């Protein structure tokens, strides 16, 4: 007997159920990767033998998202087209592993000030049964993990 309320406490979480909160809206995505926390390394050696190893300064995350092409309005083109030499609406990204109903967060990866740097077109092929998938890559400053 494992009594599935205990599965919701001590079993791990899969990666197929996630909600992406993009600014103040929810946008359905297919994939999401690159929400890393990376530091640099400071090193210092003297002649006596002391090696000093230290964390450097953390560098920027590069988050890539991908969703399909729908017949309506393209919300990801409208956010990468509004670039005027510096000026982009930064957004808060929230990617939360959710329950199957979609109403409560298991664990979330938060992203502070993201703006788009690329947007790839789908690969058009007359001999392929696939869905048109755009892939946007984002650049931010901080990745935060809230667990609840």
């Amino acid at each position: 007997a494992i009594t599935a309320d205990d599965i919701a406490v001590q079993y791990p979480i899969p990666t197929y159920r996630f909600i992406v909160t993009l600014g103040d809206e929810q946008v359905p995505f297919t994939s999401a990767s690159g929400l890393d926390i990376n530091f640099d390394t400071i090193e210092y050696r003297d002649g006596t033998g002391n090696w000093f190893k230290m964390p450097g300064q953390r560098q920027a995350p590069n988050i890539t998202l991908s969703k399909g092409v729908f017949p309506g309005k393209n919300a990801m083109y409208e956010w990468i087209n509004a670039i005027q030499l510096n000026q982009v609406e930064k957004k808060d990204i929230m990617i939360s592993l959710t329950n199957e109903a979609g109403t409560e967060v298991l664990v979330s990866w938060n992203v502070s000030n993201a703006f788009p740097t690329s947007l790839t077109s789908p690969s058009f092929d007359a001999t392929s049964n696939e869905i048109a998938v755009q892939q946007i890559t984002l650049m931010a400053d901080r990745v935060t993990i809230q667990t609840a």
Binding site: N99, E100, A101, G102, T103, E104
Partner: protein
């Protein structure tokens, strides 16, 4: 006039709005009978803007024209103009009307709205408020004595002053946030924070003015903000009971009661026996699982969300099988909006 096969040039100033409609918002722009500007057709259908400026090629300013023009510029499919003394005739005849909007109209639309609700056509009315400014010494039980006490209506006070200077009746601003919400978020989400573009309210409403008009008959302010500008601010009907408060859960049960009524009329002339009571019960159950899945019900199992019963000792009798009557009683739990966000700050960590 086109004569030769080339490319033509003109500079006659025209406008044209696209169509981005939703099927659950087909309104009824009722206008006054005391009006000679309108075409004397008592009921007429307007499928898009490019047909509406054929019947009315010159820009008016009257309350039926700033209501339709603020409808079509937010999407908006087909929609109706009916005289205020004929709205009971048109609700009963076109079968897809989901809204009654009083476009600067009262004292008989309020009457004939109460006609069709007792006949049970599953309609949702959108009314108006005072046109000149409410004082502040108003004693709100004296202002909302006029309005019906039915859960199928809402009132929406502050009148509009769209960019040409003309007046917009605030049943059209509130019906403009229903086109853009049934399209985007669904019929179950409250129509409040959706921004309606190209209009500004005539007056201004402070937070302490709306607070006395919130409970009771729920005057449903239209307010401008820095950011989401000129949204409607309040999503309550004309009844503060704990199930038919909140505009969205009423329209969520209109569309449930009508999508099950149109999906199960294709089962008439079947035998009124136990195989029919099954394929009723799996046709209702398949519809509501498409509805629970897109975030419209509450509870995180389908046993938490709905139930349905139809049968011999459940909901019918043998007196009612033999005269045909099929009774299908459904019960389902909908979501509520978060209306008040209390921030309580402190000094200690």
């Amino acid at each position: 006039t086109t004569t030769y096969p080339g490319v033509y040039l003109s500079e006659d100033a025209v406008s044209s709005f696209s169509v981005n409609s939703a099927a659950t918002a087909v309104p009824l722009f009722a206008y006054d009978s005391e009006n000679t500007n309108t075409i004397n057709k008592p009921i007429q259908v307007f499928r898009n803007w490019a047909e509406f400026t054929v019947e009315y090629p010159t820009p008016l300013e009257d309350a039926f024209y700033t209501s339709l023009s603020l409808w079509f510029m937010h999407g908006g499919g087909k929609c109706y103009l009916v005289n205020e003394a004929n709205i009971a005739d048109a609700v009963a005849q076109y079968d897809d009307i989901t809204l009654i909007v009083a476009a600067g109209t009262d004292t008989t639309t309020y009457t004939a709205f109460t006609t069709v609700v007792g006949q049970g056509y599953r309609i949702f009315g959108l009314f108006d408020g005072p046109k000149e400014k409410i004082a502040g010494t108003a004693k709100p039980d004296e202002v909302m004595e006029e309005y019906p006490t039915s859960p199928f209506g809402a009132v929406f006070y502050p009148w509009g002053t769209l960019a040409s200077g003309a007046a917009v009746p605030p049943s059209a601003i509130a019906a403009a946030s229903i086109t853009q919400t049934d399209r985007t978020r669904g019929v179950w989400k409250a129509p409040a924070n959706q921004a309606v573009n190209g209009v500004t309210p005539a007056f201004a409403v402070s937070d302490d003015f709306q607070g006395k008009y919130n409970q009771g008959k729920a005057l449903n302010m239209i307010r401008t903000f820095s950011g989401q500008g000129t949204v409607v601010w309040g999503a309550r009907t004309l009844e503060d009971s704990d199930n038919w408060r909140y505009i969205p859960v009423r329209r969520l049960f209109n569309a449930v009661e009508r999508d099950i009524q149109k999906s199960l009329n294709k089962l008439v002339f079947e035998p009124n026996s136990q195989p029919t009571w099954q394929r009723v019960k799996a046709a209702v159950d398949s519809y509501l699982h498409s509805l629970w899945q897109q975030g419209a019900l509450a509870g995180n199992t389908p046993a938490d969300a709905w139930f349905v019963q139809v049968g011999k000792d459940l909901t019918m009798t043998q007196e009612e099988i033999n005269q045909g009557k099929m009774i299908i009683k459904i019960g389902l739990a909908a979501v509520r909006p978060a209306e008040f966000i209390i921030l309580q700050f402190s000094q200690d960590i």
